[PDB]
């Protein structure tokens, strides 16, 4: 796998509500989160 870093205090990556129900990267939601998913889908690598 790969280790990916980002900042939290920004409208790009935010902690979605009900984070206790989710776990891992699924809890983090935001514009920058969708960009990371599309790039990982195009390149083809888990992260």
């Amino acid at each position: 796998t790969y280790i990916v870093t980002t900042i939290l205090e920004d409208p790009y990556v935010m902690l979605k509500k009900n984070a206790n129900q989710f776990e891992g990267n699924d809890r983090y939601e935001g514009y920058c989160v969708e960009l990371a998913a599309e790039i990982a889908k195009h390149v083809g690598y888990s992260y």
Binding site: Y2, G30, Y31, L35, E38, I39, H42, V43, Y45
Partner: protein
């Protein structure tokens, strides 16, 4: 700025200004164009094999109109006050009725 009521003009970046205007109670607005020109970008350790295909994926997403869709969704489709009266009401030169009510 919200308390000055037309007395304090804060100078910030374009993306943060558009988000604080739309995704917040819109008592302030952005006026004028950008003074300087900057640009964001994802990084990669110096001398790594994850720079070529990553750069090609960024240009592919920006060419297929995907980044413009994601921006219009998180900045406009999810604003706090929304877009009330999206059609900008032109400044009527005629005298209103409330002025002589």
């Amino acid at each position: 700025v919200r308390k000055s009521k037309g007395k304090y003009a804060y100078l910030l970046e374009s993306t943060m200004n558009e988000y604080i205007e739309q995704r917040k109670p819109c008592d302030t607005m952005k006026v004028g164009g950008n003074l300087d020109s900057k640009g964001y970008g994802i990084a990669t350790p110096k001398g790594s094999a994850l720079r070529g295909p990553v750069n090609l994926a960024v240009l592919k997403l920006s060419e297929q109109g995907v980044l413009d869709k994601l921006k219009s969704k998180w900045w406009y489709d999810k604003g706090e006050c929304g877009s009330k009266d999206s059609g900008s009401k032109d400044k009527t030169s005629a005298l209103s009725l409330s002025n002589v009510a």
